[PDB]
């Protein structure tokens, strides 16, 4: 042979890369060995390492012991050569030529070497780049590669210790196979055999999004998974600055021509991950010169309706991409249901959203890291004080919490293989099963046991934002079929307003501009304000509250479909309200002893959602601001009263709870009225009897690639929350940006 015996090689007469032997053939050799179309090695050099009597046999056996321990892939001289002998390839640093050069065999490539390389740098640019370089760009080129590239010293490696390196794009021979410089809430990768955790990715498996966008790696994914995994790690170790191709390339360390493929591909993958919002997001803001996506994406215009978390998330993204965005907001402020009172001494208290439920991988957690801000993790302790002063017996709460969960356990048994039509309110179902235990057991509940049960139901009502007789037994917890956000529940101490303001910074936002009509029967979208001002763009994104879609505040033309409307009306616009009280001194410290909150056992069944729980707004235990919630039927019981009457009502409750002392009068308070705020009229969505969690998906479907929908009530995995809304913003920005 003076030619390659592998089917279809573009090399009629090959050169050896290795030079391991003195007997290294330009010339004839029994067999050539094919690694790539531009890269071959002779049988002398093959014998050099493979054969006992030869010199390189030492190296190869050493290497094959290491490779068998760490990796799953089979040791072989081909493998050895690809891992250990093939030359490195480096592009030039200087922008004039940027030509790819081969390094001499005796030199190991490193990040700093690849950062600062000019043509012919021994430890010049007029010489023409190697023939094989342009051939690397061909489709089939990757097809004629014996082995998938394996990366050396990958930033992702510490994160991936539980996997075999080769099963995940990495070299099992690399010495460098909670990490330093990484937030405890950033866990981007699933561990092997780990149950559902929100936003995690499998490092060894392409996701469906990735398969559809990159179907060429359906056959062989390992080059993809290596580069994705690297990028994710680069992003999560340095999430305050834009990840760019320039910053990635120095971390791709693999020998051979395949390195050039890697470098060219890393750019497409990066843009895909940016658009999707997996990388280069949060409150990262880019300067006016720079944009996160290339000029191709920029010939699009968007108007975004609503400037809550959903509308702001989408705006920020699209802005950062280089797309033209303008935001129209009904109120005289941004934030929607994020609205923070800054006027209390020391602490900061939200009128809407303030807790984060599950920080791990939560985009809110990433934004807190970016702005260097604090989250207070909630403690477990919450004692239930009764109207009178008696902290409930520990063995009473424990067992009523048990009984409560068993009811729900019976509900989920009941609901199997039922249909929307067979559905029934969760509240009815609960009490039915409740009466059954009474009857079939014979044992009855005391007045206290009953009161403590009621507290637990009110927590459900708080969670749903409704009386349980409105909430679907079949589907109330639908979203839990999906992976939820793991980790800490935290109080967001400086408030979500810091985040909301940062997101908003330097965007085209029009306040006091409610939209009245949206016309998309034309070529352009036509958007009209209540006063009459007109805006037009190629695409529009509605992010208004569920309750306003239900009231039909906006005229759509064409109207929404009967399907969309059935979706919209099958969900409930849930409601809670809050009260915040200031005091001169912390009157609860003695009794409460530094818990984040304390319970309140409802005196009667009909007073159930009336200040069920009081939150201590100072993690520092210095200031005296309490916060409390009104939920369920209690919200109805408070519709008529004015703030003062409510405040008194709250005060009656506190003096009864803290009987054994003098309760000081409040110096400062607010009472929230979200339900009557004409542009909001709710706190969060929930599934009504008869409904399905598919409603979210339906509400989320764009009309004719021009009208798009984001928001709290469009996020099936993560309904109700700032995180959910934010993520729906990022999801829609991604579709809008596409093509």
């Amino acid at each position: 042979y003076r030619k390659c015996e592998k089917a279809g090689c573009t090399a009629t007469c090959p050169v050896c890369f290795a030079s391991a032997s003195e007997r290294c053939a330009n010339g004839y050799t029994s067999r050539w060995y094919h690694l790539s179309c531009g890269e071959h090695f002779c049988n002398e050099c093959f014998d050099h390492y493979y054969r006992s009597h030869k010199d390189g046999y030492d190296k190869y056996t050493t290497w094959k012991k290491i490779w068998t321990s760490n990796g799953k892939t089979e040791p072989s001289p081909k493998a050895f050569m690809a891992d250990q002998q093939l030359p490195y390839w480096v592009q030039c640093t200087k922008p004039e030529c940027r030509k790819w050069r081969q390094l001499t065999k005796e030199i190991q490539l490193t990040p700093q070497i690849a950062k600062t390389y000019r043509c012919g740098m021994k430890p010049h640019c007029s010489l023409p780049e190697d023939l094989r370089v342009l051939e690397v760009s061909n489709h089939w080129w990757y097809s004629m590669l014996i082995l998938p590239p394996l990366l050396k010293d990958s930033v992702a490696a510490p994160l991936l210790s539980a996997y075999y390196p080769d099963c995940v794009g990495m070299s099992p021979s690399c010495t460098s196979t909670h990490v330093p410089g990484m937030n405890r809430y950033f866990q981007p990768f699933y561990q092997p055999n780990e149950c559902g955790k929100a936003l995690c990715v499998r490092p060894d498996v392409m996701e469906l999004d990735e398969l559809y966008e990159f179907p060429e790696y359906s056959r062989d994914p390992t080059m993809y998974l290596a580069l994705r995994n690297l990028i994710l790690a680069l992003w999560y170790t340095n999430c305050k600055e834009a990840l760019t191709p320039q910053k990635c390339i120095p971390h791709i360390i693999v020998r051979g021509l395949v390195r050039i493929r890697c470098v060219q591909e890393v750019e497409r993958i990066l843009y895909f991950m940016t658009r999707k919002g997996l990388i280069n997001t949060g409150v990262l803001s880019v300067g006016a010169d720079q944009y996160l996506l290339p000029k191709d994406y920029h010939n699009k215009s968007v108007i975004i309706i609503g400037a809550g978390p959903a509308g702001l998330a989408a705006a920020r993204q699209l802005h950062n991409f280089g797309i033209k965005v303008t935001v129209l907001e009904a109120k005289d402020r941004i934030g929607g249901r994020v609205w923070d009172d800054k006027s209390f001494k020391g602490v900061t208290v939200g009128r809407g959203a303030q807790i984060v439920n599950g920080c791990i991988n939560n985009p809110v957690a990433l934004m807190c890291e970016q702005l260097g801000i604090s989250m207070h993790k909630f403690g477990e302790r919450c004692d239930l004080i009764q109207e009178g002063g008696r902290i409930t017996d520990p063995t009473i709460d424990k067992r009523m919490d048990f009984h409560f969960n068993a009811l729900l356990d019976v509900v989920s048994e009941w609901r199997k293989d039922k249909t929307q039509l067979q559905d029934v309110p969760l509240g009815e179902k609960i009490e039915e099963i409740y009466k059954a235990f009474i009857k079939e057991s014979g044992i009855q509940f005391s007045e206290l046991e009953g009161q403590v049960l009621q507290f637990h139901l009110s927590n459900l009502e708080y969670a749903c934002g409704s009386n349980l007789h409105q909430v679907s037994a079949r589907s109330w917890d639908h979203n839990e079929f999906f992976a939820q956000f793991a980790g800490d529940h935290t109080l967001l101490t400086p408030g979500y307003s810091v985040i909301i303001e940062k997101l908003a910074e330097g965007l085209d936002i029009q306040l006091k501009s409610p939209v009245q009509c949206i016309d998309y029967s034309g070529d352009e979208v036509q958007v009209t304000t209540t006063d009459g001002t007109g805006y037009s763009a190629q695409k529009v994104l509605v992010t208004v509250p569920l309750a306003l879609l239900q009231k039909g505040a906006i005229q759509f033309n064409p109207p929404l479909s009967e399907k969309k409307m059935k979706a919209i009306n099958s969900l409930g616009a849930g409601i809670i309200e809050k009260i915040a009280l200031q005091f001169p001194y912390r009157f609860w410290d003695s009794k409460v002893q530094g818990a984040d909150f304390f319970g309140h056992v409802p005196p009667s069944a009909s007073k159930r959602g009336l200040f069920a729980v009081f939150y201590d707004m100072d993690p520092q235990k210095k200031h005296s601001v309490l916060m409390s919630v009104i939920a369920g039927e209690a919200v109805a019981s408070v519709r008529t009263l004015d703030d003062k009457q409510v405040l008194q009502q709250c005060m009656a409750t506190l003096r009864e709870l803290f009987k054994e002392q003098e309760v000081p009068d409040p110096t400062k308070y607010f009472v929230t009225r979200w339900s009557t705020d004409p542009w909001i009229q709710m706190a969060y969505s929930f599934v009504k009897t008869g409904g399905s969690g598919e409603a979210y998906d339906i509400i989320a479907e764009d009309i004719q690639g021009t009208v798009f929908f984001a928001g709290e009530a469009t996020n099936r995995h993560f309904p109700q929350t700032v995180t959910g809304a934010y993520l729906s913003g990022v999801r829609e920005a991604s579709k809008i940006a596409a093509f």
Binding site: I355, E480, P719
Partner: peptide
């Protein structure tokens, strides 16, 4: 959704 519960959350099913 119960994913809104912070204090004394349900483990129902």
């Amino acid at each position: 959704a119960r994913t809104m519960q912070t204090a004394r959350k349900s483990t129902g099913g």
